[PDB]
């Protein structure tokens, strides 16, 4: 509308992708112009899919959405924060080359903005719309994150199913969560620096924190607090070298 | 209606709880009048519910409700078991400050219920029956639990995704159980005694018996039985140290 | 309608299992005549079954089923692999009698069938299609199946929940998978080879290969390749017996 958030690349690819995936299997056009091209924004367009998901006869698509519009007016920097965690997904993975790929498909991002709505309507003290979102998310995306739990931008969650994250855990800006991961168990549960990677599986129990840049390996089960800049492995998990 | 049955803290203090949360968010009105206060019973809004979330084209809403009124009837101490599985999530997760949190929200919960229909008609011969209603419930909350499966009052199902457990396995009274957890492999699967708590991701695996009053810490892989009044951890697990 | 083609005793068993089953429990007659009885054929019970598991606003049972019809058309092979993958059930699982149980009601076995949709439509270039669908079954099987990745027949998917398999992977004929397993990270994910089990929660990971005959020990963290016939055990995987 005007000045520099005109630039949006992300929005622009995920347009053009849905145009000429729409082109290639016309049946999926309902799907495909209900979701991306009918919608005046990339806001807009991941509000609706993530209510889509979501939706419920016991609470409706519309009223998930009309939520979500409050949400985005309330907290305006979701407009990046929503990019930036498109932008992870497009960086981290080479199984998905299109910007729309985690917006249409990733259980992943649907859940990281499931969990953005969800805490902002605890912290309104709407807690039942906050648990009813946690319910759901953990039904439908197989990720349980309690609502009180503080999420940064840029996280890639990674396949998703089985993850679970406790009501004190922090996960702070650049973090990648694989599928099967706890955070778990005053504050009583992890708290992740930036740039950290958490391997398949993997269990972070307690009130400890792992250090920016390390890397937990699939499978490790970790009790005591990481070093920044180390991977860990093992049950428990021992340090194994050094990372960047 | 009559006698010591009328005391009921648990259903009063729901009905209490969803009467304030209407009123503070108005929007859920539809879902917690539905659920809660046009029910005339706490057996009711919790067979209600749980119908609901497992209601599909194939198998109404409508249908499951009738089959679990068919089960309370002839299962009069489901009463008291869903009261003592709602009260065992109250006082063992500080997560969740109220009674009503299980019965609206946590699958875990519904998973308990619904193995108990699954069970019961198992045992009735209604094997499809019970073979969908497991099919349901593994989709949906997550849980594959055999129907022949035997499963005690008292029991937390934390947070549930992932849940396998075997034909043959028996759980005892006021168990925990985590997340990722596997009871599996005549009998060929594990038997829990009461007390126990099971960490998130173990794997109890054969015709093993893990004692009262035991832990299993998280990531366990527990190929031999277990003594009472014990915490074990490891792949495989040892005994760590003693526990009460 | 002519020739050996018409000797199928899976398909003779199932109808006369779905007779048996809808006297017993009439309630469930439009399941079972809608997903068995009114159907012409075994290919038709399980493409309509998935279908309709599948089946959402988003994209329709019968869009889904028309698509999955197309595919049988360009592979007629999927009658007898569909055939082979109920034989492994029936074959490998104690828990289930019937040959009707996992075309009905077992997720594991929709998935495979559900990759085998995805992997064509992917190859055909409609990588939209691939990817919605592998997101649907990832949201209602909880199994996450890149489309490019090569399944054989007679895959049994034990429990499933959980399972996340990667692009590049490879999976040979007669191989078991239970719940919880990673087939994960040019070529950078497992090749398995065939006859191999692989245990509950066991993560694989790499461009490596597990030999023919070999078994994955439940909670296994698997990364070096696997001999032929041996067992494996342990974080990090190490071998702890022969076997057949
Ligand atoms: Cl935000
Ligand atoms: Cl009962
Ligand atoms: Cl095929
Ligand atoms: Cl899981």
Redesign the interface.
Known sequence: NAGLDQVDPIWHSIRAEAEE?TR??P??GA??YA?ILNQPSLEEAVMHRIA??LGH???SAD?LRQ?FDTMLEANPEWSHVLRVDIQAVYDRD???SRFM?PV????GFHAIQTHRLAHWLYKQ?????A??L??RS?????T?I?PAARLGSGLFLD?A??L?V??TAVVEDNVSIL??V?L?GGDRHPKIRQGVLIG??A?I?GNIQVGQCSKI???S?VLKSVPHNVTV????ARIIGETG
Chains 1, 2, 3 share one sequence.
């Open positions: 995936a290639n299997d049946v999926l799907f495909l979701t889509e998901r006869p016991d609470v009223i939520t080479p199984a998905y790929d249409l498909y990733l259980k003290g709407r807690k039942d719309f648990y009813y946690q319910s953990s039904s439908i995306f197989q349980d309690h396949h199913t089985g679970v406790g009501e599928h099967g706890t778990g398949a599986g269990k129990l390996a699939a499978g089960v492995a093992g049950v428990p």
